[PDB]
């Protein structure tokens, strides 16, 4: 269907061209037309504030405030959320949790909490709150309406928190502080030039949310007659102001809700703008009581370009050396961000014991961390062919360990046959060191012919191998996080159609230049290039352009300094046993496992280098790799399992229930199982003082 208006704006044509759904293209055109006629955005807004500009703990309160916490959460880190919920809980407060529509695993875990406590509820509606999306404001405004209509919850303050927040002061001080200033609103402004704030936020640009993407559609004017302000979208607002925002029909609230429906990052300026221009303008404190770990040197890399038509930034994760910052006395602060348990748990532990004391001696699991990365109810189609293939292989690696660990000349009662697909997968950390994967899976014990449920721990073999140079480590992976300087593909799981990235980590010293060589499993040199390591460099990384598919097997990456060897590392390109979650067929196996289409991985060749580096190409191994490329079924499974076993180790395996294998422990009795005690994240009965911690 053609538009109702001629569409000539460059941004809008670029948006229509990139959009994927018919509904989305229609919505884009409708929005553009309405703004074109001047019927979409307000041009002048009434200001009700009489002021000329802006306004700007060890006692026991007689009338303590009751707080409504609004948690907007996403991801997989359910156990870290449980630890934080434990720290902030008191029977007198209220907890309203909105879980991103895309995080069904997390939503199932949150549901178990809301069922235990009468002052904890979950939002029945769920939005896909993408970064910078307009829907974050819709989330807050709807939860405020819900909360104001819950008459059985007489709350006085509104506080929003994410799963990466944590308190840095006790609940008793929070209540005492807010009880003294109960008629104030806590918002932090940008603290710079206002014109530059507007440009950098894109407030003079029109955005539209559709298909989980923020489309930029053109320019717009800032309405006349009001002061525009903004800053952090983390705040604390009292009930009187929430009532005004929710139910007022005056000129200010009505037009601002329309304006901010088509705004990028709306929660960073909507509440600042309304308050300063409203009758409540004299209640504003220019302080949101937060510590945000900004390090714009690392957090501004336009890393959201695939989600929004704009460049964004985000704060860094705290580390142990930052602990002293939580003890400052310059201004009152009660929360901080960000924390990530898979990035650094020590600082979280330091902070929790400092506020609420050590755990009893002998408490297990304090230095460990478990994070679920697959749960059966979400289905194998939510996995990829890569992870499905390798999780199956890890399970088989564990079953072979069990058989070999029993020493007998009679019937081996530790022989198993695998059944179905993995039930769950966990990341396992100990002392902030990644330990590998935990796979829960079903298998038949062949001696008694009975089904058993087991969990297997697999750990990657060390492969980095290192004249006092600067190099400290080298690694290959995918999904490199430039802000946190790590691979988010923790296991380094790779398939033939993946595009690996090589990373190096350097210490201090003078500038140096090094050479990098990539070698495939049959000694073909795929790429060579030199890098400059400046004096101030700490990390370097590069993604070489390799034609796909990559030949399966064990690759090697070498670093040289003027032909002088420095170090090497290895990584695994695993052959796939699945296609569309189905057993791979001969014709699709051959297309995928015989190296890239063009006999060569890049344009320039490096055959001139094989003799120099002592990488001779064995004609027998080349033909065997071709033969391997046509195998399926059992032959292919044996090739994969021989590869995985050479790069991974089955550390241990346990049973969840009764077992006939006499040498396997119960999982709950182990130190490493996701079934073992983890009291720091476990939630029990409310104590006499109203706390869970």
């Amino acid at each position: 269907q053609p538009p109702k208006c001629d569409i000539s704006g460059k941004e809008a044509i670029s948006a229509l061209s990139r959009a994927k759904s018919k509904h989305c293209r229609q919505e884009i055109g409708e929005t553009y037309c309405r703004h074109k006629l001047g019927l979409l955005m307000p041009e002048k807004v009434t200001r009700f504030c009489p002021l000329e500009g802006k306004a700007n703990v060890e006692y026991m309160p007689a009338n303590p405030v009751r707080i409504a916490f609004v948690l907007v959460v996403h991801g997989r880190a359910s156990r870290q959320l449980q630890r934080m919920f434990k720290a902030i809980y008191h029977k007198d407060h209220f907890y309203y949790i909105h879980v991103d529509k895309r995080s069904n695993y997390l939503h199932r875990q949150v549901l178990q909490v809301s069922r235990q406590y009468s002052n904890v509820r979950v939002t029945p509606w769920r939005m896909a709150t993408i970064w910078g999306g307009a829907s974050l404001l819709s989330t807050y405004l709807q939860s405020m309406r819900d909360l104001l209509e819950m008459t059985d919850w007489p709350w006085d303050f509104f506080i929003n928190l994410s799963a990466a927040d944590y308190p840095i002061r006790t609940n008793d001080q929070l209540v005492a502080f807010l009880s003294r200033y109960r008629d104030m609103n806590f918002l932090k402004s940008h603290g710079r030039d206002n014109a530059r704030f507007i440009r950098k936020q894109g407030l003079d640009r029109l955005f539209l949310e559709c298909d989980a993407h923020m489309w930029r559609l053109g320019d717009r004017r800032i309405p006349e007659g009001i002061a525009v302000d903004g800053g952090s979208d983390w705040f604390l607002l009292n009930r009187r102001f929430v009532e005004y925002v929710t139910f007022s029909t005056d000129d200010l609230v009505t037009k601002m809700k329309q304006f901010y429906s088509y705004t990028l990052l709306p929660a960073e300026s909507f509440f600042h703008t309304v308050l300063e221009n409203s009758p409540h303008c004299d209640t504003m404190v220019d302080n949101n009581l937060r510590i945000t770990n900004w390090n714009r040197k690392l957090g501004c890399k336009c890393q959201y370009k695939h989600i929004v038509d704009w460049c964004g930034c985000s704060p860094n994760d705290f580390k142990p050396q930052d602990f002293h910052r939580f003890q400052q006395t310059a201004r009152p602060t009660f929360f901080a961000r960000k924390f990530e348990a898979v990035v650094n748990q020590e600082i979280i532990g330091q902070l929790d014991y400092y506020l609420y004391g050590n755990y009893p001696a002998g408490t297990p699991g304090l230095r460990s961390y478990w994070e679920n990365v697959y749960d059966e109810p979400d289905g194998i189609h939510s996995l990829s062919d890569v992870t499905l293939t390798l999780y199956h292989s890890f399970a088989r690696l564990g079953l072979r360990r069990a058989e070999t660990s029993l020493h007998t000349d009679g019937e081996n009662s530790c022989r198993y046959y695998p059944m179905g697909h993995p039930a769950s997968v966990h990341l396992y950390f100990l002392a902030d060191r990644f330990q590998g994967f935990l796979i829960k899976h079903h298998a038949t014990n062949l001696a008694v012919s009975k089904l058993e449920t087991l969990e297997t721990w697999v750990m990657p073999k060390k492969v980095f191998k290192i004249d006092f140079g600067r190099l400290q480590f080298s690694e290959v992976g995918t999904d490199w996080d430039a802000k946190e300087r790590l691979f988010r593909n923790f296991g380094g799981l790779l398939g033939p159609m993946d595009e690996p990235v090589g990373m190096q980590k350097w210490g201090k010293g003078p500038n140096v230049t090094v050479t990098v060589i990539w070698v495939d499993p049959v000694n073909v040199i795929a790429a060579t290039y030199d890098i400059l390591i400046e004096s101030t460099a700490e990390f370097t990384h590069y993604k070489p352009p390799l034609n796909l598919p990559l030949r399966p097997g064990v690759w090697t990456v070498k670093i040289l300094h003027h032909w002088v060897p420095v170090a090497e590392t290895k990584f695994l390109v695993a052959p796939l046993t699945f296609s569309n979650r189905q057993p791979i067929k001969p014709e699709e196996a051959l297309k995928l496992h015989n190296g890239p289409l063009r006999n060569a991985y890049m344009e320039q060749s490096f055959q001139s280098l094989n003799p120099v580096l002592s990488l001779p190409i064995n004609p027998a191994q080349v033909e065997q790799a071709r033969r391997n490329a046509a195998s399926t079924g059992t032959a292919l499974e044996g090739w994969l399992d021989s590869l995985v076993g050479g790069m991974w180790t089955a550390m241990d395996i346990c049973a969840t229930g009764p077992t006939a294998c006499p040498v396997m422990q119960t999982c709950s009795q182990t130190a490493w199982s996701s079934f073992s005690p983890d009291p720091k994240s476990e939630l029990g009965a409310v104590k006499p003082d109203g706390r869970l911690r």
Binding site: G191, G230, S232, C311
Partner: peptide, 9 residues
């Protein structure tokens, strides 16, 4: 700590 999450265009 300056505030605001927007970058540029």
């Amino acid at each position: 700590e300056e505030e605001g999450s927007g970058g540029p265009q």
